[PDB]
């Protein structure tokens, strides 16, 4: 479960740079490795690489 935006607000900063919340960054990490792992398990990948 991805939480909504209010649990992880993207606070705006003195300029226009929108700083994201720690949860958003972490979901970025989970998403990237999930997508990358998905393409490996879908394809041929070493069992230790999949592990």
Partner 1 sequence: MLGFLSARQTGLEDPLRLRRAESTRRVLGLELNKDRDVERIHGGGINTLDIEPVEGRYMLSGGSDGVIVLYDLENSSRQSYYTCKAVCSIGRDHPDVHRYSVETVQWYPHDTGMFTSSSFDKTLKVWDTNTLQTADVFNFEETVYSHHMSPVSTKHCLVAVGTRGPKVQLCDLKSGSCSHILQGHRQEILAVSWSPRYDYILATASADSRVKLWDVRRASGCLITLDQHNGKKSQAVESANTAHNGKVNGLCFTSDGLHLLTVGTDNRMRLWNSSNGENTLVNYGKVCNNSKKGLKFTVSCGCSSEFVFVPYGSTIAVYTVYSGEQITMLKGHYKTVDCCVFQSNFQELYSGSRDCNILAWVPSL
Decide: is 4 part of the binding site for partner 1 (CB under 8 A). no
Decide: is 46 part of the binding site for partner 1 (CB under 8 A). yes
Distances (CA, A) of 2 to 7, 8, 16, 31, 35: 10, 10, 25, 10, 15
Decide: is 51 part of the binding site for partner 1 (CB under 8 A). no
Part in contact with partner 1 (CB under 8 A); list of ranges 10-18, 22-30, 34-42, 43-51: 43-51
Q: Other C-beta atoms within 10 Å of 27: how many?
A: 16
Residues at the interface with partner 1 (CB under 8 A): 44, 46-47
């Amino acid at each position: 479960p991805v939480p909504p935006l209010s649990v992880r607000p993207a606070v705006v900063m003195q300029g226009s740079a929108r700083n994201q919340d720690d949860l958003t960054h972490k979901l970025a990490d989970i998403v990237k490795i999930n997508n990358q792992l998905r393409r490996n398990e879908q394809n041929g990948a070493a069992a230790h690489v999949i592990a």
